[PDB]
Curated annotation (Swiss-Prot):
Annotated NCBIfam families: murJ_mviN
Protein name stated in the entry: Lipid II flippase MurJ
One Gene Ontology MF term: lipid-linked peptidoglycan transporter activity
Primary subcellular site in the record, as a coarse category: membrane
Taxonomic placement: Bacteria, Thermotogati, Thermotogota, Thermotogae, Thermotogales
Purpose of the protein: Involved in peptidoglycan biosynthesis. Transports lipid-linked peptidoglycan precursors from the inner to the outer leaflet of the cytoplasmic membrane.
Coiled coil: none
Transmembrane segments: 1-20, 33-53, 76-96, 121-141, 148-168, 173-193, 211-235, 247-268, 285-305, 330-350, 360-380, 384-404, 414-434, 438-458
């Protein structure tokens, strides 16, 4: 368990480091066409990391690597590296000659000056793909040797190098964090290079067709399942300049309470279902109560305090009062979906825990199609706020489908949690007088205390049994 607590500390600071990276973007670049161009240029390697984070490489590499032995293991590894090196080299050369293909994938609607700059930055980011693939392969090898802690922290390397590049941007401009992104991908790979170079190199691609047969179907499935990322960005690119940047500032901050409250708090309770499948309904209700307990007060507090929170973190240097006003509205639009995505995540993973992949797949399809259609309608009409809202409404639709499916929900506890959250709201509203820029921190503490006090009143009998 000591490694589990250590990994939580490591994850917290890794999340905070990403937040600090964005804080510096706001200070050194604010919201601008030039940061739009940066995000366009990094989005393909970023997107590819996300897909490999869902297991796209390990899903095929692990079984085919582990089944082999002796120098057939080296020959398999060489086949994978050689085959991908060939494909990637071809596509980086094509990227140099036709950068508009990648640009128009993520920023088709962006202005002329944006696309020109993104072309220049893509010359630097496109090679990072090669080092991301190698990183993903080494990551898989480490996983087959039961190494999980340290490989999971290597993305922090890239955030440090981007941060350093952002500091140097006062001399070079936006190209400095772009170079930092490339160097980050190189050093991420070098941090775990030994797992690859301990193998003998073979001039062979013998096993590459075998590996592709198992890799590509799953890889494409994971591409499609993460596509809403691409659609969000491409739709907003048609709005005002800086729209891409607004969406990144708001969504990257929102992912902090999302990851904590909509997913992580309910994991332990959800873990029990696999071992105790015949009590599925009880355990699912238990997990849903936990999710609601955290997401409902968090949603209320975040929305009420969205402007002072954004101001505290982002409103420095080039990030203006106007930027705070807009980013805060986008954050509210996302935060309205927090409890719905919490419920969604809880029911979906509970289904997986009992080997039902069909119902989670249908729900995910509904959410994805809903999100695309609503992006078209609301995103083209209202820019980033419309895209954020579309994402939240899509989650509501997914929740309605899943609730009709499991036909269970802890209604009594939802009402108790909601009342405690509204009592909390009433109190924080009363403490809203000073307008000091740091007062929102005290209101968060007051809100937590009020919420837990009244939680203990309404759950007194339950606390006694636990205590
Ligand atoms: C070579 C294709 C590059 C595609 C375009 C990106 C440009 C990259 C530039 C330089 C790459 C140098 C890094 C080379 C990294 C080492 C390659 C490797 O993994 O070898 C493993 C074997 O020894 C064991 O199987
Ligand atoms: C995933 C979105 C796919 C966008 C493809 C594209 O390049 O479109 C160009 C413009 O016509 C509209 O984006
Ligand atoms: C050096 C190893 C990284 C290879 C990739 C380096 C890309 C540099 C570049 O494209 O500059 C364009 C102006
Ligand atoms: C699938 C992605 C489609 C992207 C939306 C779009 O193409 O907008 C085009 C603009 O001209 C509409 O205002
Ligand atoms: C300190 C005050 C803590 C009050 C805790 C009150 C329990 C909240 C709850 O609804 O829990 C649902 C289940 O997941 C519990 O197993
Ligand atoms: C503000 C709150 C936002 C979060 C609201 C999310 C979901 C509301 C759910 C509405 C209630 C939906 C209940 C549907 C159901 O199947 O109930 C079955 C039970 O009677 C048997 O156990
Ligand atoms: C903001 C509070 C951040 C402090 C809490 C950080 C929690 C770190 C974590 O990720 O814990 C995962 C675990 O499964 C459940 O929290
Ligand atoms: C340490 C533990 C991790 C905590 C999270 C810190 C993470 C990122 C920096 C966010 C804070 C950066 C802004 C603080 C400075 C500030 O806001 O100063 C007020 C401003 O000068 C008047 O407008
Ligand atoms: C700063 C974060 C430093 C992160 C350092 C990661 C190094 C690592 O993960 O090494 C794993 C592998 O087992 C050894 O090569
Ligand atoms: C260890 C290096 C860590 C980060 C380097 C960040 C790279 C910052 C790039 C600064 C040099 C630069 O950007 O030069 C542009 C010309 O044009
Ligand atoms: C280490 C490789 C660092 C790669 C740094 C690339 C610098 C660069 O490409 O500068 C372009 C000008 O324009
Ligand atoms: C750059 C990577 C190029 C490596 C090509 C290796 C290769 O194609 O070997 C073919 C061999 O004849 C049968 O596997
Ligand atoms: C600008 C740099 C961009 C670099 C982007 C690198 C992405 C490469 C990913 C996969 C290999 C693609 C080649 C796939 C070849 C076809 C695979 C195949 O044959 O799959 C058969 C399957 O059974 C039928 O469903
Ligand atoms: C589910 C969607 C909404 C539930 C109700 C959400 C209630 C949250 C209200 C929070 C609030 O009152 O925010 C006021 C702030 O001034 C505005 O920016
Ligand atoms: C708006 C209409 C939305 C369309 C709703 C129907 C789409 C899914 C159909 C059948 C699922 C069977 C395939 C399940 C694949 C799971 C594979 C897996 O997860 O492994
Ligand atoms: C691409 C264009 C439309 C995709 C519409 C959505 C297609 C359905 C997405 C599949 C999905 O969500 O899968 C979840 C996990 C297992 O793939
Ligand atoms: C609102 C969209 C969801 C409407 C309910 C869809 C439905 O009928 O779901 C029944 C399914 O058989 C359950 O697995
Ligand atoms: C996330 C929860 C943990 C965070 C813990 C942070 C600890 C508190 C830090 C700073 C408080 C600063 C509060 C400053 C309040 C302003 C006081 C003031 O000067 O108010 C003037 C006005 O006239 C009144 O009437
Ligand atoms: Ca600006
Ligand atoms: Ca060997
Ligand atoms: Ca300020
Ligand atoms: Cl601008
Ligand atoms: Cl072996
Ligand atoms: Cl970034
Ligand atoms: Cl194979
Ligand atoms: Cl084989
Ligand atoms: Na500017
Ligand atoms: Na426009
Ligand atoms: Zn093979």
């Amino acid at each position: 368990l000591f490694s589990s607590i250590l990994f939580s500390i490591a994850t917290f600071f890794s999340r905070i480091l990403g937040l600090f990276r964005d804080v510096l973007f706001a200070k050194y670049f604010g919201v601008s066409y030039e940061l739009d161009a940066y995000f366009i240029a990094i989005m393909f390697p970023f997107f590819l990391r996300k897909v490999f984070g869902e297991g796209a490489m390990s899903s095929a590499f692990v079984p085919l690597y582990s089944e082999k032995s002796g120098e057939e293991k080296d020959k398999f590894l060489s086949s994978v590296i050689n085959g991908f090196s060939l494909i990637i080299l071809a596509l980086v050369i094509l990227s140099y000659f036709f950068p508009e293909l990648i640009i128009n994938l993520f920023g088709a609607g962006s202005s002329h000056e944006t696309k020109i700059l993104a072309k220049k930055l893509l010359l630097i980011t496109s090679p990072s793909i090669y080092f991301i693939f190698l990183w993903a392969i080494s990551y898989s090898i480490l996983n087959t040797n039961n190494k999980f802690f340290w490989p999971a922290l290597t993305p922090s390397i890239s955030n440090i190098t981007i941060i350093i590049g952002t500091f140097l941007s006062t001399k070079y401009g936006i190209i400095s964090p772009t170079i930092g992104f490339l160097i980050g991908s190189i050093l991420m790979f070098f941090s775990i290079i030994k797992s690859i170079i301990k193998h003998k190199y073979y001039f062979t691609i013998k096993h590459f067709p075998h590996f592709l047969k198992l890799f590509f179907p799953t890889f494409m499935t994971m591409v499609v399942s993460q596509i809403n990322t691409v659609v969000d960005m491409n739709v907003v690119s048609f709005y005002d300049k800086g729209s891409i940047s607004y969406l990144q500032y708001a969504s990257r901050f929102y992912l902090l309470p999302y990851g904590l409250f909509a997913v992580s708090v309910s994991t332990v309770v959800l873990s029990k279902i696999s071992n105790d499948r015949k009590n599925f309904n009880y355990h699912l209700n238990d997990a849903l109560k936990t999710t609601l307990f955290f997401t409902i007060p968090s949603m209320v507090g975040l929305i009420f305090l969205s402007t002072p929170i954004i101001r505290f973190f982002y409103e420095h240097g080039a990030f203006t009062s106007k930027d705070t006003l807009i980013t805060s509205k986008i954050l509210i639009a996302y935060t309205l979906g927090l409890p719905f995505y919490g419920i969604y995540s809880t029911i979906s993973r509970s289904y997986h825990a009992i080997k039902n992949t069909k119902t989670p797949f249908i729900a995910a399809t509904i959410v994805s199609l809903s999100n695309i259609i609503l992006d078209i309608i609301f995103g083209l009409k209202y820019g980033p706020i419309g895209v954020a809202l579309a994402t939240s409404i899509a989650g509501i639709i997914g929740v309605l489908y899943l609730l009709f499916s499991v036909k269970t929900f802890p209604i009594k506890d939802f009402l108790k949690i909601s009342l405690n959250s509204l009592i909390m709201l009433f109190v924080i509203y009363l403490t809203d007088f000073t307008d000091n820029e740091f007062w929102f921190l005290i209101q968060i503490l007051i809100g937590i205390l009020v919420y837990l006090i009244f939680s203990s009143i309404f759950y007194r009998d339950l606390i006694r049994r636990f205590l």
